[PDB]
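Dear Dr. H.,

I hope your travels went smoothly. While you were away I took the liberty of generating a structure for the chain from your last submission, since the lab meeting agenda had it listed for discussion. I wanted you to have the full record in hand beforehand rather than looking at slides cold. The sequence, exactly as received, is reproduced here:
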Amino acid sequence: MKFQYKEEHPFEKRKSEGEKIRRKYPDRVPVIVEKAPKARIGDLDKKKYLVPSDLTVGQFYFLIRKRIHLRPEDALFFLVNSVVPPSSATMGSLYQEHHEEDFFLYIAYSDENVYGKL
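The corresponding predicted structure, in token form, is as follows:
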């Protein structure tokens, strides 16, 4: 999918910011989080996150659930390079495996239709 953060910031600006963040704050990782366009769930206020490396996917899910008012029976999944990471994974481990050449990790969030209609 197309991330709006990329449309609004050219590669060299993104890469400069990403490299700076990583040099200045090596204990955290910069993450862009955007809603998959077809997902019928709420939008997050903020797209750009600087999270401690050991924050887990499940902990990020819980934070998002509170912010967009999801109930436990509502589904919520992250999609990183077309795969859904396990809730136990840390954001630092995903960053190390999947960060793009601008030194950001890009995460899409969706509902149960993350792969297409369930």
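Two observations you may find useful: The chain is about 30% helix and 20% strand. The radius of gyration is 14 Å.

With kind regards,
E. W.
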